[PDB]
């Protein structure tokens, strides 16, 4: 649902 930050330069939308 909400954003998920993995690391520097990696995300999920």
């Amino acid at each position, epitope marked *: 649902r*909400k954003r998920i*930050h*993995i*690391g*520097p*330069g*990696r*995300a*999920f939308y």
Partner: antibody
Amino acid sequence: QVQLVQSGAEVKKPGASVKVSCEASGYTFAKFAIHWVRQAPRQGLEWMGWINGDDGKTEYSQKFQDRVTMTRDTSASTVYMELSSLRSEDTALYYCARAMYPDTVTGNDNPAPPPFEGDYWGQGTLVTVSS
Amino acid sequence: SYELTQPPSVSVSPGQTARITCSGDALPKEYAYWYQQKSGQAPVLVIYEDTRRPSGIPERFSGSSSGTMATLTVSGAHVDDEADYYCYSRDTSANQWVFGGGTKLTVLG
């Protein structure tokens, strides 16, 4: 079996530098980034930055961007964190913590929400800045 | 900018509900995470992704998030729930993680 073991405590002089090491074991070192958060005595937690295990790309806090540099050893499965221009106010307990989410997106895969992979911290390293 | 703010202290009687509310403008689109830190111990994550518990945390700990507010709730507080509670979320503008100032939970009586 996931473990993050940090280097031992040490005294350092004002103006010198520290480099704490954070050695990982029990998981694929490449698929996880590693945080660094510190806590001065009787103060709150403050995030310093994190760095991925594979590419070594770093991202620093606005408070520490001048003095902190973070690196990692691809072969040794260890991330490092260095703070120069040490003052007495940098006397703190320095933790490393594995990121909550592994890297599922870089691989060839149509959307898959990366799962929460647990709360895992190092034991911390006390850095005393004194003469 | 951006900041997460939580009260410094919250007092609760044994058996009733304690509520720690973290306020942040990015909470509508950013998850909130809650850490428990007892005296002389490392932080322990008790709530991940606004409302989920890491496996091993008692279910009397619960979390929610609505608008600019994220709340950690301890239903029927034990004396053993006295600790410092930190909220933790993403600062997208500055591209950094941020902690709340922390809230000391005092169990009265």
